[PDB]
A paper describes a structure:
Hydrophobins are small proteins that are secreted by fungi, accumulate at interfaces, modify surface hydrophobicity, and self-assemble into large amyloid-like structures. The amino acid sequence and molecular structure of hydrophobins are diverse but there are some characteristic features, including eight cysteine residues that form four conserved disulphide bonds that are separated by three loops (L1–L3, also referred to as the C3–C4, C4–C5, and C7–C8 intercysteine loops). Class I hydrophobins assemble into extremely stable amyloid-like structures called rodlets that resist denaturation by detergent, heat, and acid. To provide insight into the assembly process, we determined the first crystal structure of a class I hydrophobin, SC16.
After optimizing initial conditions, SC16 crystallized as a cluster of plates over 1–2 weeks. Virtually indistinguishable atomic-resolution structures were determined for two crystals of SC16 that existed in two different space groups: C2221 and P21212. An α-helix was present in L1 from 50Lys-59Leu. Residues near the N-terminus and L2 (C2221: 79Val-85Asn, P21212: 78Ser-85Asn) did not have interpretable electron density, consistent with these regions being flexible. EPPIC detected a large intermolecular interface that was present in both SC16 crystals and had a surface area of 607 Å2 and 589 Å2 for the C2221 and P21212 space groups, respectively. This surface involves both the N- and C-termini of SC16 interacting with L1, L2, and the β-barrel of a second symmetry-related SC16 molecule, with 44Thr, 72Leu, 89Ala, and 110Ile being flagged by EPPIC as participating in close contacts. In particular, the N-terminal tail adopts an extended structure from 27Gly-32Ser with partial β-strand character that associates with the β1 strand over residues 42Asn-46Asp of a symmetry related SC16 molecule. Although the buried surface area (~ 600 Å2) is smaller than the 800 Å2 expected for a definitive biological contact, it is larger than a typical crystal contact, involves a very small protein, and is found in two different space groups. Repeating units of this interface also result in a linear association of SC16 monomers that suggests a possible assembly pattern within rodlets. We found that although the N-terminal tail of SC16 associates with neighbouring molecules in the crystalline state, it is dynamic in solution and does not significantly influence the self-assembly rate or morphology of SC16 rodlets.
Numbering used by the authors: 11 to 62, 71 to 99
Write the structure that this text describes.
Amino acid sequence: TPPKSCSSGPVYCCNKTEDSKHLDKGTTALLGLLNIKIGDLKDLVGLNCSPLSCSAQTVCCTNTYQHGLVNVGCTPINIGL
């Protein structure tokens, strides 16, 4: 068996995360641009995310858009000791 963490998807390293209930206007605007419905989102929104070393936020996300411009359905994950 290989090591496993996220139930769905790779671990992501996201430069920034925000609570999907308290997104700033630029983040909100960017998600509308991408046609993402805010009211159907849960947990965190990640910005500028790369699948996995991470000096920013390591998160599990259900979806990633535009090469990691925006992730959604993100929750923190600890893959250390």
